[PDB]
Design an enzyme around this catalytic site. Structure first.
Site, PDB file in Angstrom:
ATOM      1  N   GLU A  44      43.060   8.902   6.356  1.00 26.35           N
ATOM      2  CA  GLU A  44      41.831   8.651   7.083  1.00 26.35           C
ATOM      3  C   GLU A  44      41.673   7.148   7.306  1.00 26.35           C
ATOM      4  O   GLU A  44      41.775   6.351   6.371  1.00 26.35           O
ATOM      5  CB  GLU A  44      40.629   9.225   6.372  1.00 26.35           C
ATOM      6  CG  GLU A  44      39.316   9.047   7.137  1.00 26.35           C
ATOM      7  CD  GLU A  44      38.134   9.722   6.464  1.00 26.35           C
ATOM      8  OE1 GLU A  44      38.305  10.357   5.398  1.00 26.35           O
ATOM      9  OE2 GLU A  44      37.017   9.622   7.013  1.00 26.35           O
ATOM     10  N   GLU A  76      33.110  18.831   0.162  1.00 22.26           N
ATOM     11  CA  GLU A  76      34.253  18.091   0.715  1.00 22.26           C
ATOM     12  C   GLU A  76      34.863  17.317  -0.440  1.00 22.26           C
ATOM     13  O   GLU A  76      34.119  16.687  -1.203  1.00 22.26           O
ATOM     14  CB  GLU A  76      33.797  17.094   1.761  1.00 22.26           C
ATOM     15  CG  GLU A  76      34.930  16.346   2.482  1.00 22.26           C
ATOM     16  CD  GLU A  76      34.416  15.434   3.584  1.00 22.26           C
ATOM     17  OE1 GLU A  76      33.310  14.901   3.442  1.00 22.26           O
ATOM     18  OE2 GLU A  76      35.123  15.222   4.589  1.00 22.26           O
TER      19      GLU A  76
END
Length: 270
Positions: free
Chosen positions: A241, A139
């Site tokens: 986010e 990620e």
């Protein structure tokens, strides 16, 4: 040698500051990547086990560089909103040549997105032939900005106390130093279910809300530090986010483009 593209279709991020209107908004999870009509991009709306009231609105194919969006959240449990390239076709990063992203946005202020938050470029990649089984799924984040929290200013770059892991190195690109961090997530949720995987971060030392990200330069540097991405890049998308809080993100510009080393455009929107 890589030459920066100067093609006329590239929008100057510095002065791309007209409020956009006419979004199409999504208020629930997208179940992974979903394509956008008339667009090379896909979006994803994701939340952890819930609290809810987030919206994600795409500003369409014909304005804001084609990938511009606005998001809001109200006490989410880790809301991720992202839009950009979706690949997942068994190709390494270098297959996509030189990737760039021009951006300009506004957002809510300090401490409106919880104890952690990220803004910038995000995705995943797979490297099944990595000897270290922890490194077969990656990620990644190129962090241009965040919302800070009670303890640290949004004008101060996050560090390993937020990301976890280890400072591996640093370099300078697009007008700032970036700190490079590698973290191991141990039996955590991923795009391949609950497992151990690695995270790669470039943290911009001088946070900003507009400019150009030379994405492939980060990929090159991580690989130079032994942080390999492997042969199956999943996506490359602009992300907001928010770990919690109540706030907004509102892009006037998000424009992805890809060019060869001589600076010729291979792909651009609109």
């Amino acid at each position: 040698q890589v030459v920066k593209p100067t093609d006329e279709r590239i929008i100057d991020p510095s002065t791309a500051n007209t409020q956009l209107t006419g979004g199409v908004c999504y208020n629930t999870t997208s179940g992974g990547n979903k394509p956008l009509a008339g667009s090379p991009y896909g979006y994803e709306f994701w939340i952890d086990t819930g609290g809810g009231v987030c919206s994600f609105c795409w500003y369409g194919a014909d304005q804001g560089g084609g990938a511009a969006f606005k998001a809001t959240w109200t006490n989410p449990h880790d809301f991720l909103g992202r839009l950009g390239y979706f690949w997942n076709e068994n190709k390494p990063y270098s297959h996509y040549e030189n990737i760039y992203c021009g951006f300009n946005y506004t957002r809510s202020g300090r401490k409106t997105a919880g104890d952690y938050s990220y803004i910038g470029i995000y995705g995943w990649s797979r490297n099944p032939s990595a000897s270290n089984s922890n490194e077969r799924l990656i990620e990644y984040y190129i962090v241009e900005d965040w919302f800070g929290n009670q303890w640290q200013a949004d004008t101060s770059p996050m560090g390993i106390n937020t990301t976890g892991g280890t400072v591996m190195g640093s370099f300078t690109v697009d007008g700032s130093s970036y700190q490079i961090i590698k973290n191991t997530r141990v039996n955590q949720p991923s795009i391949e279910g609950d497992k151990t995987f690695v995270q790669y971060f470039s943290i911009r030392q001088s946070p900003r809300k507009s400019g150009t990200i030379s994405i492939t330069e980060h990929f090159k540097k991580w690989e130079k530090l032994g942080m390999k991405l492997g042969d199956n890049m999943y996506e490359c998308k602009f992300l907001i986010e928010a770990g919690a809080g109540e706030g907004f993100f509102d892009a006037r510009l998000i424009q992805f483009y890809r060019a060869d080393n001589e600076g010729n455009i291979l792909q651009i929107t609109p």
